[PDB]
């Protein structure tokens, strides 16, 4: 829900960020089938 | 009233599901000063928040 132009949150300002006037698409899917183990090798800043 | 308010401690806390602000931006709160806050306190079902 944070991956939007101008959003702010615990991901969407401390690391990754979309322009305040973006042109584009965001595409996401659930991946608990394959990326879960727990899997500590996924990290943020 | 009559006190200094570091919001960084609250905003960087992982304790919160939401921090939505409706006439000021939470990033800029430390750069503001105002007359009074008034904190309103209660509990509800999560589906009603």
C-alpha distance from B18 to closest chain A C-alpha (Å): 9
A13 in contact with B at a CB cutoff of 8 Å? yes
Q: Closest residue of A to B26, CA-based?
A: A8
- CA A37 and chain centroid, separation: 20
Q: Which is nearest to B11 in space by CA: B23, B29, B35?
A: B29
Q: Which residue's structure tokens are 């089938």?
A: A33
B26 in contact with A at a CB cutoff of 8 Å? yes
**Helix, strand, or coil (residue A30):** coil
**Which DSSP category does B9 fall into?**
H
φ, ψ for residue A29 (rounded to 5)?
-145, 150
A1 in contact with B at a CB cutoff of 8 Å? no
C-alpha to C-alpha distance for B24 and B33, rounded to whole angstroms = 11
Q: Say which residues have a Cβ less than 8 Å from residue A35's Cβ, sequence separation at least 6.
A: A42
């Amino acid at each position: 829900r944070q991956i939007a132009p101008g959003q702010t949150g615990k991901i969407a300002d401390y690391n990754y960020k979309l322009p305040d006037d973006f042109t584009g698409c965001v595409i996401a899917w659930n991946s608990n089938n394959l990326d879960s183990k727990g899997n500590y090798n996924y990290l943020y800043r | 009233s009559n006190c200094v308010a570091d919001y960084s401690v609250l905003y960087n806390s992982a304790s919160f599901s939401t921090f939505k602000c409706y006439g000021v931006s939470p990033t800029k709160l430390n750069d503001l000063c105002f007359t009074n806050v008034y904190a309103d306190s209660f509990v509800i079902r999560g589906d009603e928040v």
